[PDB]
Design a protein around this ligand. Structure first.
Ligand SMILES: [Zn+2]
Ligand SMILES: [Zn+2]
Ligand SMILES: [Zn+2]
Length: 178
């Protein structure tokens, strides 16, 4: 197995996947690495299994249809994986914890949002449809773009949103377009 966490790229107390060479810190994995279960399969392996069991699941989909799906176990897992893919980018540190807003010439967002809040919301099964999860994820970056205005720091929101969106289109097999 790898000797660093797949998400944060640090060593430490790592739990190893039994079906692939990836490793994780306990709370870097989403959901948090389970207490027992030998063997243990990581979220990357669990997602691969879904695809292998239903190869047609990779045919193109309309975003509108994906968003309306109820959060049954497979959609739950897919949102957890997409959330994990965002944390895998080091620029996610900017969006992880609860933000605060005191900048001359800007007002804070009406509805602040951050990754750890989405993580808790998933854990607590607070989303009933994929749309709930996707809306809160997109809101993180929209809030950032609006607040930082013309500061070049706005680009961090664009960058991490692009990682979100590419992974969304991959995991949920959104129909490719020009
Ligand atoms: Zn880690
Ligand atoms: Zn694995
Ligand atoms: Zn099938």
């Amino acid at each position: 197995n790898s000797n660093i966490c797949e998400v944060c790229n640090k060593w430490g107390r790592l739990f190893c996947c039994d079906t692939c060479p990836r490793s994780f810190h306990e709370h870097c994995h989403i959901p948090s690495v389970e207490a027992n279960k030998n063997p243990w399969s990581c979220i990357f392996c669990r997602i691969k299994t879904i695809q292998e069991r239903c190869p047609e699941s990779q045919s193109g989909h309309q975003e509108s249809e994906v968003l309306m799906r109820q959060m049954l176990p497979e959609e739950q897992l897919k949102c957890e994986f997409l959330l994990l893919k965002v944390y895998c980018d080091s620029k996610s540190c900017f969006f992880a914890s609860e933000p605060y807003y005191n900048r001359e010439g800007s007002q804070g967002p009406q509805k602040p949002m951050w990754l750890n809040k989405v993580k808790t919301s998933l854990n607590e099964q607070m989303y009933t449809r994929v749309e709930g999860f996707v809306q809160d994820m997109r809101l993180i970056f929209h809030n950032h773009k609006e607040f930082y205005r013309e500061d070049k720091f706005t680009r961090l929101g664009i960058q991490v949103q692009d990682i979100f969106e590419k992974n969304f289109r991959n995991i949920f097999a959104i129909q490719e377009t020009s």
